[model samples]
Target: DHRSLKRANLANTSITCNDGSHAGFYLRKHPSSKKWIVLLEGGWHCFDVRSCRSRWMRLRHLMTSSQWPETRDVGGILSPHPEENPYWHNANHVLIPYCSSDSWSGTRTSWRFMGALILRQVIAELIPVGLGRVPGGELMLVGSSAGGMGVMLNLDRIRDFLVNEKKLQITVRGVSDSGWFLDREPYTPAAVASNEAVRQGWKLWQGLLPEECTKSYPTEPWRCYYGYRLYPTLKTPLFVFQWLFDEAQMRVDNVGAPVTPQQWNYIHEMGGALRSSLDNVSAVFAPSCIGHGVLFKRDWVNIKIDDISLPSALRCWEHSTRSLRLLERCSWPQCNHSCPT
Candidate 1:
């Protein structure tokens, strides 16, 4: 990979990966696609990918028109957005399942693992017979909530391979819905951010953090929870959505523990740090007090771009004009970048 991150912009989930498309029913049945294909509708055995696609669609419906479906209660369900529909038409998806976070020595797999596949297989499935002969093509990686956390978890693993690809101009689109990246170090704000682990996930990676930084002891990089800081390494089009009120702090126990005025002012603003990642890529941030990444599909409740999440979604969707931009240039460094295989 190239040595410099001058062009990248960055940003998983407890996504289980599989072989038969719906491995472990990992992605579940895609709602819209339910009318198109006949696969598993939904399952509780494991987290599925279709679960995300549906979330995108519903989110878009919510944002584009302020109306959610009547028959099914969205409850904890997530759907798709109206703006992103163009790419899904004939889009091929590959789910990569990895058990380790860093892949270094002695690393054990966690239930909340990065699921390490990244977006590699999706490429192989979509590479048409003459894909290289074509002038340009669009490729995107969109993550939300814990999915956003996946970016940082996999960041450092792809160092050298990214700096040496040839002539294929694939436009990379990155979207983070209700993204969950934090900058807390020595003591991750995730597990303790709230009395409940589900409230915030800052501590999810401690299982993989290098030994120097530990619960019984401490060390430098006091706060490596800087997943947000890695944003600049992404070399594609970027879009981000930040919810004003759903700080995850509220979900923490006591309802007021981590929601401190100081933490709110200092901690939750990780989305703002994304400003530094916008150098070579087209960047947009949609800010709102709505809730985490609920802004991506604001129309569900009749929301609009002005609400905070619209800018990034709209920007990537409109990025069609600059299709096939380089995500990781040949000379770019790969030490900590999302690179080619």
Candidate 2:
């Protein structure tokens, strides 16, 4: 049966969206599965009041749950079609829409940047409904872009919350898609502006970063927002799915079309940066592509590096004892023919 995920609002009033609308998620339960995949929806964040206001005006759906449909049809990992999503198709799925505009890291009291709280609230609500019911339940927290950063920032906390707080004996892992952002100097003015906005958002949103990471960069806690800086401190098993030349990052860096020699050099450096940062990560599926996200993309099955697609790598990670590192050897962007046009 090809049914859509039903929308369910949070029971708590404390956790809300940027526009003070009730935060919610889309749920699809499997008939006989204890495995769950909770996807945190991704939308770029807004740091200050002005930026938040601008975001609300331009992308109101992302900033609020006011216009969300009763049910949502999904693709990629959340797709119910066995042919489309072989591994996770039969698993219970929960799609938490991006509404906080905080990269799912905020816990502010004033303007309702409650992304961190929203995640916790959603899990808490799901506990009674069979989330942590079985002793050997599986929970995979998946996200892309901003939400991918969310998975990096909150995976451990959620794991601990279930294991320690709720006393549930469940295995929790994470799959971060296109969220492995580099920490480096801005290439252009736009990049600088974006960096400053992230800094401002870190402070204004009162971002609840991982304690282990924040303590290392006590002088500049905002660095924890970058995946390279945060990845090391994470305790949970994480599968990093990133593009060598992330399109979103390139845009943020103000890399335009008809690239010059200097721009190409910068792009090469960006790829190097991503590759180096992922050196320590045991499980990764980085391809030499210019695209942004893949976990939710229709071509998730086709895209491959070393003949190992994301789905293949993820499946390997799930079953194998050895690490699943599938980084592309090519340097240039779109070097892999499987990359989407």
Q: Count the backbone clashes (under 3 Å) in each candidate.
A: 62, 0
Candidate 2 runs further than 4 Å off? 191-195, 321-323
Tens digits of per-residue lDDT for model 1, 243-276? 4333452342123444466545443343233323
lDDT of 2 by residue, 129-213 (tens): 8997988888999999999999999999999999998899888999999987764666776524656777898988889999999
Per-prediction TM-score, please? 0.45, 0.95
Give the range where candidate 2 is weakest over 10 consecutive residues by summed lDDT. 186-195
Candidate 2: give the clashing pairs.
none
* Residue 243 in model 2: lDDT: 90
Instruction: Let me know the TM-score candidate 1 reaches against the reference structure.
Output: 0.45
Best by lDDT: 2
Q: lDDT, candidate 1, residue 242? A: 41
- RMSD over all Cα atoms, model 2: 1.8
